[PDB]
């Protein structure tokens, strides 16, 4: 979500994906490994944070017959202190987890882009905004070979080298 200036609202198929425009039409197909990785990581975060502590707390005050004022102010004092502690812990917990979640998604995006880049040794060149300018016309089946990580890294080399 860095230099990628915006997101694809039409990509309702997944989190990340490819959108190509060569000569045989248009293409927009989502990627499964990176999206599934991020989904499994966030799912792990939720499964870890959602938790029911088996610790049972009994009644220490009394709502119908108020206890002594001194011990009652001590109990209220302690409960308020603990409440402050748990409010702080909840605030910092949620904030930190959100930060690491956003940076995690950006990291997975960067891993996708770096993988697709390393898959194209010298057959294509970089442009500026998360795209790959091809110097040999790659048909739709070749684009599919790029998606499923089967595009050869030499069988189209010298054709695009001289370009």
């Amino acid at each position: 979500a860095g230099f990628i200036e915006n997101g694809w609202e039409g990509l309702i198929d997944g989190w990340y994906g490819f959108r190509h425009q060569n000569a045989q039409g248009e293409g927009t197909a989502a990627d499964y490994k990176s999206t599934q990785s991020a989904i499994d990581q966030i799912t792990g975060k939720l499964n870890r944070l959602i938790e029911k502590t088996n610790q049972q707390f009994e009644l220490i005050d009394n709502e119908f017959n108020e206890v002594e004022k001194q011990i009652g102010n001590v109990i209220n004092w302690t409960r308020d202190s603990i409440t402050e502690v748990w409010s702080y812990n909840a605030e910092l917990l949620v904030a930190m987890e959100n930060q690491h979640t956003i940076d995690l998604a950006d990291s997975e995006m960067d891993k996708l882009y770096e993988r697709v880049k390393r898959q194209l040794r010298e057959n294509a060149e970089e442009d500026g905004t998360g795209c790959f300018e091809i110097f040999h016309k790659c048909d739709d089946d070749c684009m599919a070979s790029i998606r499923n990580n089967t595009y050869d890294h030499s069988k189209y080399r010298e054709e695009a080298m001289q370009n």
């Binding site: 490819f18 939720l46 996708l112």
Partner: protein, 314 residues
């Protein structure tokens, strides 16, 4: 070929370490706010005390006649509950309440106190059944003729079981000194208690106090816990509400105070006066005094956890 991420038109703002109000794709709630306005008691042994007080189940006023030997996993106290029929008060009442909430029920057992030379059938207009009655588990000890005198008596009871027993006696504070001399005779009265860990003094104080149930006198209730193979002794001589049966804890339970209805359809382990908190979230903003297996109470009403990526639309 280009490659990018997804986005949505309407995102969800959250808070991070860096910014406050980052619009992300998807988010969830971590602070529970929804409440079930009922006492979810599915699968639990529930005893709704109602008009009977928790301490009364040891003494036995009329309203507790159906709670003398109860057994529960979840004990519920009601605001209309009363611990006494004759006006009086318990000493260290909240400690005994906290003992009885996790007791899992009580089991009475006769102590076997035989009296020779006194009367033992006192009653009052407040504790009413068929006519003028008294506490079910207690015996109002008086003298034999109207007025007369009370002989220096001494009783004793040994706990012959493996669990600590609950012993509760009473001290009658008369409306006036002349009436105390009418019930127990003239002279000083002393109700001595005794055990390996406890023992004390307990002198009565006759005085015309106020009106609550309609009367003026009082009866103060005191209690101790006898260890196994330990003995209790009562060297008394007047103004004594003798115990007839002792109490034994059944096991383990939980006690709550609420004013909502009992519902055996839903299941919950976190309770409060307003109902049951059924949630898997780690935090809740409903009641700070919730008891049971509850999420930790916080002051914030909402804390959104990010489940999606950064939402950057066109």
């Amino acid at each position: 070929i280009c490659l990018g991420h997804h986005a949505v038109s309407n995102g969800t703002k959250v808070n991070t370490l860096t910014e406050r109000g980052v619009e992300v794709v998807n988010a969830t709630e971590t602070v529970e706010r929804t409440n079930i306005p009922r006492i979810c008691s599915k699968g639990k042994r529930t005893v709704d005390l109602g008009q009977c007080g928790l301490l009364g189940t040891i003494t036995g006023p009329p309203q507790c006649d159906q709670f003398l030997e109860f057994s529960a996993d979840l004990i519920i106290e009601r605001r209309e509950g009363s611990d006494v029929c004759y006006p009086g008060k318990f000493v260290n009442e909240e400690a005994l309440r906290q003992i009885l909430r996790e007791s899992g029920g009580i089991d009475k057992e006769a102590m076997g106190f035989t009296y020779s030379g006194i009367r033992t059938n006192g009653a009052t207009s407040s504790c009413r059944r068929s006519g003028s009655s008294f506490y079910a588990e207690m015996k109002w000890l008086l003298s034999n003729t109207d007025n007369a005198a009370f002989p220096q008596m001494t009783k004793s009871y040994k706990n012959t079981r493996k669990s600590p027993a609950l012993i509760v006696w009473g001290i009658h504070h008369s409306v006036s000194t002349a009436e105390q001399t009418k019930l127990y005779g003239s002279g000083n009265k002393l109700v001595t208690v005794g055990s390996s860990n406890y023992q004390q003094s307990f002198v009565p104080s006759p005085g015309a106090r106020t009106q609550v149930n309609g009367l003026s006198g009082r009866i103060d209730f005191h209690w101790l816990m006898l260890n196994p193979n330990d003995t209790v002794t009562f060297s008394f001589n007047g103004a004594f509400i003798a115990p007839d049966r002792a109490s034994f804890l059944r096991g383990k339970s939980m006690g709550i105070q609420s004013g909502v209805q009992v519902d055996a359809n839903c299941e919950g382990d976190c309770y409060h006066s307003g109902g049951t908190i059924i949630s898997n979230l780690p935090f809740q903003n409903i009641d700070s005094r919730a008891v049971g297996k509850c999420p930790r109470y916080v002051k914030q009403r909402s804390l959104l956890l990010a489940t999606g990526m950064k939402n950057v639309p066109e």
